Design a protein that fits this description.
Pfam families: YqgU (PF21101). This protein has 326 residues and is mainly β. The protein has one domain. The protein has no helices and 32 strands. A hairpin with a 5-residue loop joins strand 6 and strand 7.
């Protein structure tokens, strides 16, 4: 079977948020002031309604276990809500009221009852809290950086920069219940990510290269150097698939180190355990990518409207824009 696309009017299509299963995605559209969330089958075009709202959408995330959605939305300039919605029937599992503030969310993969979030406002700069939505519990997280990730049930890693404009920082591990537990685990890191028990770090390695390290007790088990791009502000990091594991890490890679054309990258698949690198496609544009837990299909694009098959190299239009306005 191959991916079949559906046509959606340009202004109506908002985005594909991500995968819901090996053969379906979460589709967001809007019409007459109502935002609709649907499950869309990638092979047969069947749609299933999940939830709809007239509220302003700020963030939508799919839970690590693909069972729930987090919706952060605002009813007005004075009221916003974070809701957890069940994918199977669109019911509200939990909700909390707040103010419409800029927020970044981190869903705990090990204990998906917990969502940590960073809120920003000029009154306090940034702050971090953990919401256990199953227990109606909100706890402060005393971590001195907004660059964070869960590492377990009660552990968070943060990249602590000495000055806010710094490219590099130092990675610390701490238990969210007690900041006295803070401990340096990796020095001089620019960017990091965690997934499937792997800690990915990215750091400059001379001005000509970026170094991607893969760590388990933080045992460093593979290194990959890519040509380094940079822009007017510093190092440029191409997109990678956040859904990586010990055997699959997908990233765009530049052809040469240079100051930042739509054919400037190749898409590669790295297997850090097997120490192998394969090019999926050459002469591509760097845009977001997201894989599923299983199989070789990867959403591609700022709106995730295309699918790349990483086994064959074939690309498919999942959401088609009409060729003309009609």
């Amino acid at each position: 079977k191959e991916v079949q696309g559906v046509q959606i009017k340009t202004k109506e299509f908002q985005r594909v948020v991500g995968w819901l299963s090996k053969d379906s995605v979460l589709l967001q559209t809007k019409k007459s002031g109502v935002t609709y969330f649907e499950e869309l089958n990638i092979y047969n075009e069947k749609k299933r309604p999940i939830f709809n709202t007239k509220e302003s959408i700020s963030e939508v995330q799919i839970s690590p276990d693909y069972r729930n959605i987090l919706l952060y939305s605002a009813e007005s300039a004075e009221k916003a809500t974070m809701r957890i919605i069940a994918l199977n029937d669109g019911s509200t599992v939990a909700s909390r009221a707040t103010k419409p503030l800029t927020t970044t969310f981190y869903w705990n993969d090990e204990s998906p009852e917990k969502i940590m979030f960073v809120t920003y406002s000029p009154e306090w700069n940034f702050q971090i809290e953990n919401w256990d939505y199953t227990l109606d519990q909100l706890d402060k997280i005393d971590v001195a950086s907004p660059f964070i990730s869960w590492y377990g049930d009660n552990l968070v890693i943060s990249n602590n920069k000495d000055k806010p404009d710094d490219e590099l920082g130092n990675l610390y591990l701490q238990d969210i219940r007690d900041s006295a537990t803070k401990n340096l685990i990796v020095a001089n890191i620019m960017q990091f990510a965690v997934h499937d028990n792997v800690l990915l770090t990215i750091e400059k390695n001379s001005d000509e290269k970026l170094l991607y390290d893969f760590r388990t007790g933080f045992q460093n088990f593979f290194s990959y150097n890519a040509a380094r791009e940079y822009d007017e502000l510093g190092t440029f990091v191409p997109y990678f698939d956040t859904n990586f594991d010990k055997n699959t890490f997908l990233t765009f890679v530049p052809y040469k180190s240079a100051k930042i054309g739509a054919k400037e990258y190749k898409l590669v698949k790295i297997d850090p355990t097997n120490k192998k690198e394969s090019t999926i496609l050459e002469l591509m544009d760097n845009q977001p990518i997201l894989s599923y837990e299983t199989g070789d299909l990867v959403l591609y694009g700022y709106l995730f409207d295309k699918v790349i098959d990483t086994k064959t190299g074939k690309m498919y239009n999942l959401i088609n824009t009409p060729t003309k306005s009609f």
